[model samples]
Each structure stands twice: as C-alpha cells, then as structure tokens.
Target: YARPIIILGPTKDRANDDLLSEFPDKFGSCVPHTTRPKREYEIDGRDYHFVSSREKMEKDIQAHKFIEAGQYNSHLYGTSVQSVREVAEQGKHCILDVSANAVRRLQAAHLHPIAIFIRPRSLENVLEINKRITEEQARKAFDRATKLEQEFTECFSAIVEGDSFEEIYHKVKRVIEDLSG
Candidate 1:
C-alpha cells in the first residue's frame, strides 16, 4: 500500500489549479469533499464535491475513507483517499495537502509516500513583500510554520520554502518533476 503525493502547508491547493492548466495532461488534482452547499458561481465537481448528504460524509469519515477531515466553522470538509487515487488512475501525478497526523498514519500502514512541506519564508520576507500584511500577521504565520516544521520534520520527504509564490511554484514544479519522473 502507498499514499499518493501529499502536499503539506498553506496554499497547497493553489498550485494544483495552476499546474493543471499549465500542463493539462501531466498533472491532475483531487477534488476534496465538502458538506457545505455550493455557491452559484462554482462548478459542482470543480470547486468541491458538495456532498449531497451530510450523513454520508460522516459515515465515510468514520470508515477510514478520508485521509484528512475537519469541521471548519462547523461545516465538514475533508480529503478522501478514494478521490486521491482517482487521479493516479488517470496516469497523472496526484498531490493534495493533509494534516500531520494523516501523513504519519499512512506511513504506519505502509511507507514511501512522497510529501512536500510548503513552508513560509522568514518574517522579514513576509513583511517586506506584502503591503497589507502587518508585522503581527507575519509573525503569526511564521510561528505556525515553525511549530509545524518542528513536529513533522521527520515525516516530510522534501521541504519547499515559500518566500515568493513564483519561486515556490517553480521549485515545487521541479520537485514534483524530479520525484515524479
């Protein structure tokens, strides 16, 4: 047994969208399931699964169908291993972000999952780049990253520093290519 390519950290989803458009045939993304009702502007499957049944999602979560599950603002959202493997079946590289515990659990079952940890850049860089980002805000992001890195450093296969989106995207693209190739 093996896990699909897993991405860890903030803004991991952004890369998947862009990568699919940039290389249509090479990369594919798993659409995470959500219990929340869909907004008019978003496509049903494109944005999220928009699970028709709340009860169904809960049952799946309990059944070990989900790799990561959480109640955000009291609404259910989770990534399923079933959805992850669907992309792999298409012969495209599949990647998605999941929680730290999720990474460890998969490893315990069977090892060798390629995981990339997307980390925030230094505080100076965070503050220096964004006009709207306050020092306090920058520090908070940095603190969270530090805590995450400390706890899960051993589980990660590669670390990608997100100092800049372009840099992060290009390096991330390479990491997937090198590992995927």
Candidate 2:
C-alpha cells in the first residue's frame, strides 16, 4: 500500500527535497540517472546516478532498464525501475521529482504513481522564491505551474497551491498520509 509520490513542478525551489526530509521515516527518494556531467556539489548515485556517456544511457534504454528517459540540452537523463523498487522494497514510499511526460512509462512499469502538482500561489510568490531570476522568469514559472495543473489534471492525484513553503509542505504531507492510509 506504499504508493510512490511523484512530485511534478516547474519551480527551482527545493520543496520536494524539503518535504522528503520532513518525513524521512515515511518516504525515500528514487535517485535518477543522467548522462549529464556531475555538478561539483553532487555525488555519484546519491544526488543522481551520473552515467558518463549518452551511449551508455541509450544502451540502458534499449535494454528496457529505464522506466523513463529523456534528453535535455543534449544530455540524456532517466530513472530506472530498479531504483524505484529498491525504495518500495524497504517499506517506504519512493518520492520522485519528475516531468509530466514520464508518468505513463512509470505506470507501464507497474509503479502506481501518485502525482502531486506543486503550483505557485502567484507571480509574487515565484519572484520571492527565486529572487535572482528576472520577473519574466518568475512569470514563466507561474505560467508553467498553471499550464501543468490544467494539462495534467487527469494525471495528478492532488494539485497543491504553494503559497508558502510550510503550508505547501503540510498540504503535501496530508495528501501523502491520506494516500498511504
């Protein structure tokens, strides 16, 4: 009954990570793999399973090891079925922060995905959260949130209005609790 909660949002904020931290006992993250170069701050297999080359990622995809795979700026990225199953096998729900497109493949892998769309309360909220970014960026973030909510309404189990981080966290926690119960 431990259904994985896949949090899909457009913002750059670490709300999903924060929520997982808030409930360590209840949730675990499925570390995704990427062929992109590892950032200095990230660790191999922890932040992500940083595969060295696109060829390797393509090979894995061909092998049907990846539940979902995509390319961003020429860099290949994906999440594998094994990583998700490892978390669920431990009696904890896996938390995945993935795109709206990956939902079908995850379902095809038989992982019952509980999608939660995180929406920014307003343009002001987006600006406030991402101070360094331009107003246009904030607006785009807000727009993306709205678009995602509308576009993925059928896909999501819950649409969380993220006015404040704490409020959003509580709302997500409640949703998780309700689902798990």
Candidate 3:
C-alpha cells in the first residue's frame, strides 16, 4: 500500500481541498467523527459520524480508538484510527488535512505519514484569506504558523508556499507523485 499523505497547514490555506480535488482517485478522505449535532444539509456518515451520546464518545476515548480528540464549543470532535485504516484497507493513500500536533500521533500509530506544510506567502495575506477574523485573530494565527514552521520543520517532507492556490496545488501534486512513485 502507498504511504498516507498528511497535509499539515495553518488555518488559511486551501491546499488540502485543492490536492484532494486534483487527484481524487489517488487519495481517500477519512471522515472524522463528532459529537456535535448535525446541520440540516449534512449527511450522517459522510459529513461526520455523529455520536449522539457523550458517554459513547467518552467510552471510545477510554478505549483509545481515537487518534486525537478535542472539545470545540462544548462539542467533541475526533479522528479515529479505524477511519484511517479503512482508507488504507481500500488500497488508496489517505489524505489528512490536519494540524501540526497530529504528526507525532500519526507516526506513533504507524501510519507512515508524509507531512507537507503549507505556508502563507505573507502573514498579511492571511487576513485576506480569512476576512471574518479580526486583525488580532489573524496575527495570532500567523504567529502560530510561523512558530510551527520553525519548531517542526524537521517533521515535514515538503513545505509548499501558499502564495496562490494553483502554485500550491502543483507543488503538492508533484510531491505526492514523487513520494507515491
């Protein structure tokens, strides 16, 4: 089986979606499970495996099925080991759009993660991409991205500049093809 590709990035980059779109057949997406209530347009299994009970989520967490789990706005969201394995079992490389922290966790799980960091062209450009966010929010996100890039540069297989969607997509495509070959 081809090793899984993990696209690690700051909040503003759309590299993950672009890669998935560009090579749909070459990758599989692991739909994460969440304890949040389903929105009107969301399908149960496709969008998220919505676990209704907090006790069930807790039970699974205790059993160590989740690769990582966290609470957002009093709602639980997590990616499970089972989810990733399902993609691998089907003989397609799993494409993970995840944060920097998941790097070690995926490695410990023996998933052979190839991490690609997507960097914004400029910290100021982050504001353009994320217009809803305040200036302070943009600054904090930029700071985090900069810090993560410095701290985890060794963890990445490639660092693609997010100057434009097309540039990032092509670079990431080349990287995946090279690695997959």
Candidate lDDT scores, in order, read: 0.73, 0.76, 0.76
- What are the candidates' C-alpha RMSDs? 3.9, 3.9, 3.7
Per-residue CA lDDT of model 1 for 1-181, tens digit only, reads 2236677654556666677789877766688889988887987767888888889999988888877888887789987776766777677766555677777665543534578877877777655434466789778867877898999899887898755767777877888777765
Output the worst ten-in-a-row residue range by lDDT, candidate 2. 8-17
Alpha carbon lDDT of residue 62, candidate 1?
Answer: 84
What is the lDDT ranking, best to worst? 2, 3, 1
Q: What order do candidates take by TM-score, descending?
A: 3, 2, 1
Which lDDT tens digits does candidate 2 get at residues 121-174?
Answer: 788987654557788887877888888887778888788775556666678778
Clashing residue pairs in candidate 3 are none
What is the per-residue lDDT of model 3 for residues 86-115, given as tens digits with 9 covering 90 to 100?
A: 887777778776666677777878876778
TM-score of 3: 0.74
Residue pairs of candidate 1 with colliding backbone atoms: none
Please identify model 3 stretches exceeding 4 Å from their true place. 10-12, 37-44, 120-141, 162-165
lDDT of 1 at 82: 66
Candidate 2 backbone collisions, by pair: none
